[PDB]
Nucleic acid binder design. Sequence first.
RNA 1: GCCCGGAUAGCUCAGGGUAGAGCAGGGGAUUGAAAAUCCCCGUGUCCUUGGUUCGAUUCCGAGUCCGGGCACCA
RNA 2: UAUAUAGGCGUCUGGGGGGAACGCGGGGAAGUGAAACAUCUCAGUACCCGUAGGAAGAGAAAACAAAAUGUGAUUCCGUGA
RNA 3: ACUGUGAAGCUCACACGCCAGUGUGGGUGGAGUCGUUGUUGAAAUACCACUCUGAUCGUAUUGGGCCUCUAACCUCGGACCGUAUAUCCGGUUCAGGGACAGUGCCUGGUGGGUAGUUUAACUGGGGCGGUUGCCUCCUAAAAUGUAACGGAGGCGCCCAAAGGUUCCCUCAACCUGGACGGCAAUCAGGUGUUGAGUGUAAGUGCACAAGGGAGCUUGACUGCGAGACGGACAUGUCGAGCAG
Lengths: 49, 102
Amino acid sequence: DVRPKITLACEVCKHRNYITKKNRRNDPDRLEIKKFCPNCGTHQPHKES
Amino acid sequence: TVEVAIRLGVDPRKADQMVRGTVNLPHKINFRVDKQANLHFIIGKASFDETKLAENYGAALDEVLRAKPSSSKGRYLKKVTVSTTTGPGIPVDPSVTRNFTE
RNA sequence: GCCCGGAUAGCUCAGGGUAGAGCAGGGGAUUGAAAAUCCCCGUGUCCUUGGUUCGAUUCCGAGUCCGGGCACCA
RNA sequence: UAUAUAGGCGUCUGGGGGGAACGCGGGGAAGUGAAACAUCUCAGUACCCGUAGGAAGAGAAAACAAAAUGUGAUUCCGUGA
RNA sequence: ACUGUGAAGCUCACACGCCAGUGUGGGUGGAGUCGUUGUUGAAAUACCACUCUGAUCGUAUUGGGCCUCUAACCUCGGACCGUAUAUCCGGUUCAGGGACAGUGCCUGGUGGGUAGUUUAACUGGGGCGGUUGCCUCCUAAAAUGUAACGGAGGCGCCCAAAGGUUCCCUCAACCUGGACGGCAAUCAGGUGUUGAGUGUAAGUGCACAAGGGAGCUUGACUGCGAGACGGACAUGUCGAGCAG
Ligand SMILES: [Zn+2]
């Protein structure tokens, strides 16, 4: 779908916090990014599901 | 003699469905599932001690159970063989999974 | 959405250590010329990515374009 | 056709049909509404069949209830709504 | 790992076999192959356990395909009886079919044979054609708003940087000089205040840069939100600021 919807889950608690879109031809790998996690209370690494 | 040879019910052809283990039990080895979904370890035979290797066998089994693939379908442990060098049968019961030394 | 099948030279199609066969095209040969036939060639990411393996066209996974049957009460 | 039976004679006792409404058991529409229509409604209504009685049906827990030593067959009214 | 409850070596048979040799059993005789063997991705045909690919044996469970037999069931085949009258009906018996067919429940297919219905609106009458939602400009009469099958276009995306922040820079065009090189590639000097560019239409803006380049980075957050714009309603839009 070129730009599908992806969900970013926390590394630590595995909660799904954010949803966004990325180009799966430019970025074939799972997106890695640091976002605020309400459960942990601090900025944690988030990964695509 | 004999050994610990189990037949994990997993599809080794699939990349995800691969079982690899490493345990230590004195009473660091490497275990890799064959291309035909078999696992072999190093143990003694019937004509040996009783509780010496019983703790050793229990620790290795827990390593395989904890390493079972998430996509495995069907029974996981289908057979375990402890047959001697010339003796037939001697198959361990696969149901035993907790407190073997009893 | 589920289950099967197809992709291999310019064309058609057979195939875990083989890329091949029949038509096309180029030169050589036979013939008195001509046609019809024999010889030697050039022709290929084996749909595209990745994995197992000493080694894949062949086994496995994902994806692309077609085809057949069935399922589909925001 | 043998056991016998179907059947045939004789004699007693019943049945049949009608009725305005009410009752019980079955079969069962459409116009209409949804501002169209098929699920749905109309409606188990209209109509049809089988049957009674002065009334009928139901009725004496293989029931409710919720830790209370609570009610205690059925039917019909008012609330619950 | 083996041998006298008797190895090899030869010979007897069988099955596979690229008859290269393998595997099984038998006999004579009795004292063996086997570890680094040298190449090799892989070493022993020393042996063992699990197992793959085909091939074959057995016991257990388990499904399908047929042929038979008669007793269920079927016969608008024959003959008797009820029956004086009966091409109805029922019974008895012979002759045929026979667990099939027919029927009940469940289930897939075909099914205008039949039934209930749907088959949009705008529109210089209706049909044919075209259009239906969102964004920009003109008509639009210098606040806002304003119609016609009036005049022109675009959208149903893209970007992991083309987002955040800090710092630095100024284009397009023209003139002059330069190997290929020319109107135009890259270099150098001068004039050059916006005529270039801003992912994508148009408009309003941007040289103070919102345009060009680089370093780090994920605020393309969590709980909220005074006060407003716009509005039939449902929608839509802006927002300082507080805490993590
Ligand atoms: Zn977290």
